[PDB]
Symmetry: C6
Subunit: 286 residues, 6 copies
């Protein structure tokens, strides 16, 4: 070997098969998907470079709001990384701060370490990682977990990848207070969402996750709803959406229970109708 065919590796790795898996398994967020397509390319090239004699550097940060594909992309990353020979067992260990820090004084270091043992050969995924740093609280022993984490991200490299994730404002603050992470994360990925279309996409995903469908009439009813809701006080984006869908679901349940034609099937029970949304006082004025 002297040169390297990139497409040979791309087609030989099954990396394309994981990138396809990502398009199919994430309701269109092309922005992000392209960014992962691009990182795949770099990950490919870096590997081809390592195969011609030139340890990588892999850790990444995923920042954005709830419901932007952080977890489901992270899973695919572990895949991709296992397919490009960066990781041995391409498996994702997803953990919060409450899996790494123990209440008792000294029961944190074995806990982080053992979680790490389970992570080895794959990817550790620390959701809202910045919660490990709580000097707000006394008797929270999260600084030890940081120390052990930080030490691992520099030293014990070739057998682990770490992904910190969560809100960006909170992550960037976490790096201020705990530097040495910025230099250890090679991949900062922003997960963007909200515009009406985005809020509607969210509404749609939420309903897919619950196995409910809207009737076309109800879809337009929601689009109306959203536009109005965003001009009323204390609009909470995604929360306001969950909340509307919750109340819609409650209304749909009562609509059906009160009708009672007789037996009804999955479509009748999975469908949110125009009535269920338009009955909201959001359409009255509040």
């Amino acid at each position: 070997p002297t040169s390297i065919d990139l497409r040979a590796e791309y087609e030989g790795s099954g990396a394309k098969e994981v990138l396809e898996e990502l398009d199919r398994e994430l309701i269109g967020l092309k922005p992000v998907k392209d960014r992962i397509r691009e990182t795949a390319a770099l990950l490919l090239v870096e590997r081809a470079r390592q195969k011609l004699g030139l340890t990588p550097t892999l850790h990444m940060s995923f920042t954005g709001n709830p419901g932007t594909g952080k977890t489901t992309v992270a899973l695919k990353m572990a895949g991709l990384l296992h397919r490009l020979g960066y990781v041995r067992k391409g498996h994702l260990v997803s953990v919060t701060r409450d899996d790494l820090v123990g209440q008792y004084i000294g029961h944190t270091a074995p806990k982080t370490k053992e979680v790490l043992k389970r992570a080895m050969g794959g990817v550790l995924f620390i959701d809202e990682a910045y919660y490990l740093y709580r000097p707000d609280n006394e008797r929270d022993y999260g600084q030890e977990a940081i120390e052990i984490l930080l030490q691992v991200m520099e030293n014990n490299r070739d057998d682990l990848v770490v992904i910190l994730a969560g809100y960006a404002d909170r992550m960037e603050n976490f790096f201020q207070s705990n530097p040495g992470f910025r230099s250890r994360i090679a991949h900062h990925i922003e997960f963007p969402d909200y515009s009406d279309e985005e809020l509607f996409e969210i509404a749609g995903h939420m309903l897919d996750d619950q196995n409910y469908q809207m009737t076309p009439e109800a879809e337009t009813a929601l689009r109306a709803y959203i536009g109005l809701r965003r001009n009323q006080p204390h609009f909470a984006n995604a929360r306001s959406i969950r909340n509307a869908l919750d109340r819609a679901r409650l209304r749909q349940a009562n609509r059906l229970f009160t009708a009672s034609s007789g037996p009804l099937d999955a479509r009748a029970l999975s469908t949110i109708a125009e009535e269920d949304i338009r009955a909201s006082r959001v359409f009255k004025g509040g």
Copy 2:
């Protein structure tokens, strides 16, 4: 099975028998009772949907003032939930923050866990839950109880339902500081009551709970009392009501002891008369 008769489940579950039990066992708060009627409908439908292949999501929050039916509705919920096959042993474990958090450093995690063991197959009911988060205090180890609680509400699902309850202002603040609860509570129920009529309803419920009745004359005497009391300093709503009723009870006891016609019966001993309320310095001016 292909369609599902909802009324068949509603009548087969005995869910109606628990909803009747609620009307009979809660002095009219039709507002709330309708909201529970409605949630019952959704809980019904969701179940019928789970029975056609489409884990639920059950936790709820009860917000409002003291004396609005939070506990007595929660009890009925545990019933309803057991009747709709969501819960195995339909029993309510009611706990405050002082049942989950221990003084000693590490004697909290076994305590929360064991309470949880007692809760399993039924409903855990955390009154004024927001008191678990006390970063105001040092040496209070309530954050561990939150961690264990939060972990349970996501992971170990199909064998427990949690109801956080208490004042709304304090609950919404608690979610700010401890997010991840908002997404875990599927049912936000507001318990409304204060207007004179509400204060009078409260007075009425308090007296029912103690087995005392008022004479019509005394009722109007209280309505007079309330209107005056609310314009005097340090009006404490429900507390001022308990306090007036306490003093009325004391006056009624002394009225009866001092009269002493001879023997007297349950009505004489259960009745608060016009004298007992009007004797208050609230009618003098203070």
Copy 3:
């Protein structure tokens, strides 16, 4: 039984015999004594009501200054309560915060619990109870004692009565910080004593407690003293009174030792004379 003769219970209980015992054993504070007379009536009636099928609710708070009869009334309460079948062994366990909270981390819960064991069947009396809540101090474990106390006042009812006592300003603050006590205390009793007459009453009680009498001339000498003292800086009410009486006692002792007519009797040794008070620089101007 269908009706109930109240006087039959009042005379059968020996409750009157304890109320007489109170008049005889408390230098006239008719205000309070009437309030206890009245509570007795209610306690009577409530009992007669429980005997016709209609658990009581018994805990109380005693608020006021040192030397108003809190302890000596509490003792009689335990009596009264035992005579009306509310309490099994009518005995009063009087405790401060230093009997419930231990220095060591975890040596508080057995200590509160064991004190409670000694209290069972009678009345526990927590003097200046608000001292259990010291978040001012670190390493004071008083919050656990509160938790155990609070739990007992709701759950393990029919075998214990609790009386919190002390200054009112401090008690009401204690309820702010630790709510759930207000609802558990059914009896708020205020112990009143300052106006000149009150200061003089205090002076009088203090001297009774020490077995000293004043000569009429000395009484008027004190009334003069008080009026002057209250217009001088740093007037501390009751403390200033103790302090004057202390100095009077010292002067009386030296008056007698220096005279030495020969032997002298109890009256000579128990009497504070006009000289003993008027010799004060309070009469000179300071």
Copy 4:
């Protein structure tokens, strides 16, 4: 017995023999000595009253500056108290805060208790007692010592007397923060000192304690010194006196070493001469 001869007890107790012992063993502070004479009288009378059927109340506070006779009066008190049958073994146990509070968490309660065991039948003397209350410091466990102390001063009475002593400003503050002491101290004794004569008395006592005498010429030299020193900045009363005497002693030593007539005797070595004081830059202007 019906009356009581006071002089009989005063002469029979040997109380006079301890009061004489006080005059002889305290360089004239007649102010204080009279106050102790007076307290003796009251202590006498109270005893004669207890002997005619009318538990005492004994604890006291000694406030003032260093070098006013607090300790040497306290010793005599223990005497007096043993002679008037208030105390069984008339012995004084003198302790600071560092004898009652231990560093380790829980090694304070046995330490206070054992000190107290040694105190029993006599007088415990807590110098600068207010140092037991250090909420300024964390990991100081002085509040437990307060609790145990306070409990002893009310409950276990007839076998112990406590004397808190030290600066008055600091003592009165200590009572603010720890009330319940004011009511437990029956004897507040102020120890007054400074006027030139007092500063000179102090100088004199200091030199007696060290076995040094001044020559009459040097005495007048000091009186000159004092008057000047008090008008220069940062005058520290007693400290400035120690400091002058220290420097005088140093000068006297060098005066003698440099002279060296031959052998010299106790007078030559015990004497501070006019040279030793007048050589001070205080006489130059600084």
Copy 5:
């Protein structure tokens, strides 16, 4: 021996062979290299002085930014020091604060001590040493590590050299708070890198460390980039450089993957082209 030939020692030690090793193994930072050349001279002379009868004093501080040669110079120091007979086993033990301080209360002193055992006969290298002093955090036991460190730097001298390193602002602050280090460091070495040329040098070193080269066209493209970037908000110097190079690398990877002429060699894969930098929105205006 009477005089000493310095060049004899310089050539006999192999000290020159380590200084050559430094030029070859550190991409030109002549500023620093001269400072190390100079220190070598002094270290030489001091040794020649010790060999004529006149314990040295060796500890040093390395201050500057990431990527200025601190570690790679420290390694050579250990060499040099071993070649001039100051150190027995010329080996460098590189440690952070997380290797010296343990979470548990008392598991720090054995940990520092054992690290020190491994350090003996060579050089201990504490990166960002100032992190040992964290009074910001409770339950961090770093002050003990300071104590043990400080004690070693004075007492147990002839068998250890310590090098504290990191940012200068943070180091000088660390000396304020922990004095006694300034007197123990005999060698303060500043590591300089920002001016455009410096930022470009940094960019260059970063790319060397990653095995990437720029085409001359791309170099000028970066110089353009830098000048623009420094006038846009939140310019973070070196971070902004890493960030640009990261994004350039990502663009280079995608440029190559998308072209796909066929096989490509190390130069094609190591080269960042003009396209990869100029594609930045920094050239659009943001």
Copy 6:
């Protein structure tokens, strides 16, 4: 014996031989040396007084800047004290706060105590003692070391002398906060040095301690240097001097290494020349 020949003791003790040792072993600071001469005289006399029947009082404080002879005088004191029979084994135990206070909670009292055991029969020397009082820090247990120290300085006297030393501003503050030390220190010794001449003396002592001499030309070069340096920002007195001498030493080493006439002797290697100082940018303007 009746009188006492002082010169007999002075010549018999070998006290003169230690005072000579002080002149020879401290580069002229006649001010201090006279003060120690004088204290010797007093220590002599006090001893002669104790030998004629009239426990001493020995502890002292040494205040001043770094480099004024505190340690080297303290050593001689231990000598002197052993020669005048005040101390049994005339040996000096020199300790900082980091030798008395342990990190762990309770590992301070054995540590202070054992250090004290090593001190017994000689002098304990606490450098910068005021660092034992750190209420600035939590989890520093220095107050216990104070307690044990303070207790020793009063009680266990005849087998230990304590010397607190360091900056005066910081010492006097330490006495404010921890009184009872002022009365326990019988000897306050001020160590004076800064004026140009003093800075030059310091420079001179520093160079003696390192075995370097200046050429007369270089001395005047330093005097020039000092005058300029003190008018430039952040002048740090003694530190600026060390720093200049360090850089001079570095320059001298490089001057010699670069010349290389051939062999060179101790004078050439010990000498700092005019070149080595004048090459400083302090002479350029910065």
